[PDB]
Motif scaffolding. Structure first.
Motif, PDB file in Angstrom:
ATOM      1  N   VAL B  52       0.466  -1.210   0.061  1.00  0.00           N
ATOM      2  CA  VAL B  52      -0.086   0.574  -0.077  1.00  0.00           C
ATOM      3  C   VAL B  52       0.762   1.010  -0.108  1.00  0.00           C
ATOM      4  O   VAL B  52       1.563   1.317   0.949  1.00  0.00           O
ATOM      5  N   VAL B  53       0.810   2.470  -1.304  1.00  0.00           N
ATOM      6  CA  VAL B  53       1.446   3.115  -0.545  1.00  0.00           C
ATOM      7  C   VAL B  53       0.453   4.569  -0.578  1.00  0.00           C
ATOM      8  O   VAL B  53      -0.523   4.273  -1.814  1.00  0.00           O
ATOM      9  N   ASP B  55      -1.463   7.753  -0.536  1.00  0.00           N
ATOM     10  CA  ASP B  55      -1.903   9.193  -1.447  1.00  0.00           C
ATOM     11  C   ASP B  55      -0.940   9.839  -1.432  1.00  0.00           C
ATOM     12  O   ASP B  55      -0.475  10.897  -2.812  1.00  0.00           O
ATOM     13  N   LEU B  58       2.891   9.256  -3.047  1.00  0.00           N
ATOM     14  CA  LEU B  58       2.628   9.025  -4.177  1.00  0.00           C
ATOM     15  C   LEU B  58       2.812  10.557  -5.077  1.00  0.00           C
ATOM     16  O   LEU B  58       3.322  10.378  -6.113  1.00  0.00           O
TER      17      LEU B  58
END
Lengths: 52, 100
Positions: B52-53, B55, B58
């Motif tokens: 999971v990255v 928001d 990113l």
């Protein structure tokens, strides 16, 4: 038209980003079913935030 | 455990924002489709919290890409990060005129 496009992105995500063997990847027609109702927003999230 | 309950659990692990409101029974139909079942099973196994990255990261990374700075490949990162002692070596506060 929108469902078909997302179905392609998901396929690309599954094969290119998460490493699913192309042979096991369901037909685009079949993946379109996953974007029915509330499932659509879920899989959009998955494609954007979930990486290898 | 109904296929649907597994899916919703996986989504919670993946920090999906509406995941607490989702009832597993509502998704049991997705697993009835003999053809999609293998994919969904795969997904529920393959996707963990490490994938999971947020928001924020990113966006920060996209900004880094846009900043024209070369994005270091895994090999290069490994080389440079080795040189990184975990130890909090306090950011050499560049000897702030204050330090001098």
């Amino acid at each position: 038209m929108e469902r078909r496009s997302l179905a392609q992105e998901l396929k690309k995500w599954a094969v290119e980003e998460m490493g699913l063997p192309a042979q096991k990847a369901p037909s685009e027609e079949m993946l379109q079913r996953l974007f029915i109702g509330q499932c659509g927003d879920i899989w959009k999230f998955i494609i954007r935030h979930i990486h290898s | 455990m109904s296929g649907g309950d597994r899916f919703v659990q996986t989504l919670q692990k993946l920090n999906y924002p509406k995941g607490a409101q989702l009832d597993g029974e509502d998704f049991d139909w997705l697993f009835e489709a003999v053809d999609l079942k293998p994919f969904l099973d795969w997904f529920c196994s393959a996707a963990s919290e490490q994938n999971v990255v947020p928001d924020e990261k990113l966006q920060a990374f996209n900004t880094l890409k846009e900043s024209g700075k070369p994005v270091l490949d895994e090999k290069a990162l490994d080389e440079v990060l080795k040189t990184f002692s975990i130890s909090k070596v306090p950011a050499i506060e560049e000897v702030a005129i204050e330090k001098l």
